[PDB]
């Protein structure tokens, strides 16, 4: 019995139970290391032996959209495309910009895989079109409101996707833990001090992600104040 998977199928209008789910994120927190995580779920259970780490290359400046687009394109072309089974559903740890990046890569790869996003630091689902996770549908019955779905926190479809996010975020946290005699990209933030600098590393994925985030998300970080959050916002968008 798979409550979460069955709910996903109905809620995202999938053609069948999503037995294979792949989760993706992207960070650049230490030096020039731009890294994308891929986590694999089969039958609603993580398969850690199948997780993968993509080193993003060819970028001379960070760019979260291009970082996600390259990862997805890599995943659905060459060797991996040949070797790996297509997921039934891809989960993007990212808002609309990161969902767009995934769809862009899929279109360029010539592949049709259903996609849904989770808005960073929120529980809002981001849908890739109007008709659910199958973003290539031209018509059908509308899913969600303005291409988003808000579900109660304990809803089984939501808890499942939030578990995939937790797994990919944790995989990121593990890698950055290892990387840490290099300063973090947040070590240049003024007005906040070193306890708050380090608290941001858990909640944000890159200078770009921090800079675009509502000041309210920054202030909600434990250890932060509306004040230190205004200070970060102002410094990054000064540069």
UniProtKB/Swiss-Prot annotation:
Subcellular location: Cytoplasm
Major location (coarse): cytoplasm
Superkingdom, natural source: Bacteria
GO CC term (a single one): excinuclease repair complex
GO biological process: DNA damage response; nucleotide-excision repair; SOS response
Keywords: Cytoplasm, DNA damage, DNA excision, DNA repair, Excision nuclease, SOS response
MF (Gene Ontology): DNA binding; excinuclease ABC activity
Record text on subunit structure and interactions: Interacts with UvrB in an incision complex.
The family this protein is said to belong to: Belongs to the UvrC family.
Function as written in the Swiss-Prot or TrEMBL entry: The UvrABC repair system catalyzes the recognition and processing of DNA lesions. UvrC both incises the 5' and 3' sides of the lesion. The N-terminal half is responsible for the 3' incision and the C-terminal half is responsible for the 5' incision.
The protein's name in its UniProt record: UvrABC system protein C
Range of the intact protein held here: 367 to 608 of 617
């Amino acid at each position: 019995d798979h409550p979460g998977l069955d709910a996903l199928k109905d809620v995202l209008a999938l053609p069948e139970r999503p037995w294979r789910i792949e989760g993706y994120d992207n960070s650049n927190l230490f030096g020039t290391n731009i890294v994308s995580g891929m986590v694999v779920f089969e039958g609603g259970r993580s398969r850690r032996g199948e997780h993968r780490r993509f080193k993003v290359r060819g970028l001379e400046h960070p760019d979260d959209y291009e970082s996600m687009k390259q990862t997805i394109y890599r995943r659905f072309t060459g060797s991996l495309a040949d070797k790996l089974p297509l997921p039934d559903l891809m989960l993007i740890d990212g808002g609309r910009g990161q969902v767009n990046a995934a769809l862009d890569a899929l279109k360029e790869a010539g592949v049709q895989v259903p996609v849904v996003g989770l808005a960073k630091r929120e529980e809002r689902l981001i849908l890739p079109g109007r008709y659910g996770a199958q973003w290539w549908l031209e018509t059908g019955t509308e899913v969600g409101v303005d291409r988003e779905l808000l579900l109660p926190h304990t809803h089984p479809a939501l808890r499942m996707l939030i578990g995939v996010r937790d797994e990919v975020h944790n995989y990121a946290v593990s890698y950055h833990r290892k990387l840490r005699m290099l300063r973090s990209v947040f070590d240049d933030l003024p007005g906040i001090g070193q306890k708050r600098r380090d608290a941001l590393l858990e909640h944000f994925t890159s200078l770009e992600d921090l800079a675009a985030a509502p000041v309210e998300h920054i202030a909600a970080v434990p250890g932060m104040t509306l004040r230190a959050a205004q200070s970060v916002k102002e410094f990054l968008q000064a540069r």
